[model samples]
Target: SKTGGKISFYEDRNFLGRRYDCDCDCADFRSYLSRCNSIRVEGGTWAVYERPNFSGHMYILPQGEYPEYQRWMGLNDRLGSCRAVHLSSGGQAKIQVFEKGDFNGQMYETTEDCPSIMEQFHLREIHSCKVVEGTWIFYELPNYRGRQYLLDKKEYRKPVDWGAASPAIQSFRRIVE
Candidate 1:
């Protein structure tokens, strides 16, 4: 079995206009919500897509309240699909980091923290990645230091997609909770 989640959408900013609540994957929101100008994630993490059936621009929302779409850095008011992020039942965290885009090039896997990718894999940067299990935090420098970016169970074709200004990831660690 899998955990359940909830999220509410509003057609106007500040949570005004038409209202709708979603508890599972919604492939088409046009008929149900009108437009999504704001959203509130009630529980668990969710991936919102710009097109139906989980296509186009994807944004991951952790459990929290988002009063406006702009609060999530949304580029527009159109949201076509959304779904919850399914984590492993056993809670074993696994992450794969690649030196190139499209999950190509040097790769490393770990369930524990890697204080230095250079020390372990002799690599200095991560260009792409996939979070196969638990949530994780990536750092710009070694020893789990410097600027960080949070990652969930998703595929990032480019490091910038995960909020990295540049491909300078050198260390990372999993978030226990």
Candidate 2:
């Protein structure tokens, strides 16, 4: 798969033993990407949501700062209901299913009814308010136990407390909730 953006790392002789900001200059940085692309001698990766001073920055949309998605959290699978489970640490929320395009115009009794084929139907956390169109429903993932489950975990363990009072949910319809 293609990476969303360019990524490169290298030891700048000027800061060989110290830390400094990496630049985006393709010609000067291409070699850095090639040399540091190897897994050995490289530090492990960090979670997008785990960055320092990352509060409220994890859910930042690609559009830009002050994006519309920042204002409205997506509605739950069930229309009128917005469910979001706080993380195990309670610092942020981790959503299960958001926009259910397949079941938007209908009522769903189970996740099976809300087919996963819909691109926006997957799981992730939101930082704003949202309203899913087509009678959208937000179903708490059973396997994911809300605060007990890790966001990066492959399986579900619990569910969210669906409603407006929960974390702001950006609609999956237009925004990249």
Candidate 3:
């Protein structure tokens, strides 16, 4: 069971041992609900669990909130955000990083037998980043953070014109003030 968790901020500084509302039913299942952009866990697989159904490839951009903007780009949900084309052969997954101005990036996981092309792909899964060694790691603002949402795998056979597709892929991230 992937029970989700969250990070909450305070008027005063400090977390990890702050008191939070526990009106829920489980004493061990307490939560913090504020405008925190990151999260941490004591003993479990913690992740940036989106509110409900968010879509888009989340990236960690490097910039502040003002005088600069956060970048969370990818193709729409169906077509694939920040997508790239990969050419794989004989059980290989070729990956290329996005050029500074590239619209999207791509991923390829292929087998030897079919050699089928899985172009127009999106990042369906990702990791949850937090502070490490007293340094903020994933705070690369104006870049991107994370993306999560539902994928209608059955309908999307190929990449759709995400910008023009109906039912836009649901996506969002924190806007640090």
Cα lDDT computed for each candidate against the true fold:
0.83, 0.24, 0.22
lDDT of 1: 0.83
Give candidate 2 regions above 4 Å deviation. Answer: 1-3, 13-109, 114-177
Tens digit per residue, CA lDDT, model 3, 1-177:
112322221212233333332111121221333332222222222222123222333432221221111212322212111111122222232222121112233322221111111122243321211111111111111233332222211222222311222322212222111
The better candidate by lDDT, 1 or 3, is 1
TM-scores of the models, in the order given: 0.49, 0.16, 0.17
- The superposed Cα distance between candidate 3 and the true structure at residue 172, in angstroms, equals 52
Which candidate comes out best when scored by TM-score? 1
Number of clashes found in candidate 2: 34
The sequence of per-residue lDDT tens digits that candidate 1 reaches over residues 1-177 is 256688888889888898877788888787776678888887878899888888889988888777878889888888888888887655678888888888889677777789888998888788888888788999989878889899988889987779855999888988775
As for TM-score, the candidate ahead, 2 or 3, is: 3
Candidate 1 segments whose C-alpha is farther than 4 A from its true place = 91-177
Note each model's CA RMSD in angstroms. 13.7, 20.5, 22.3
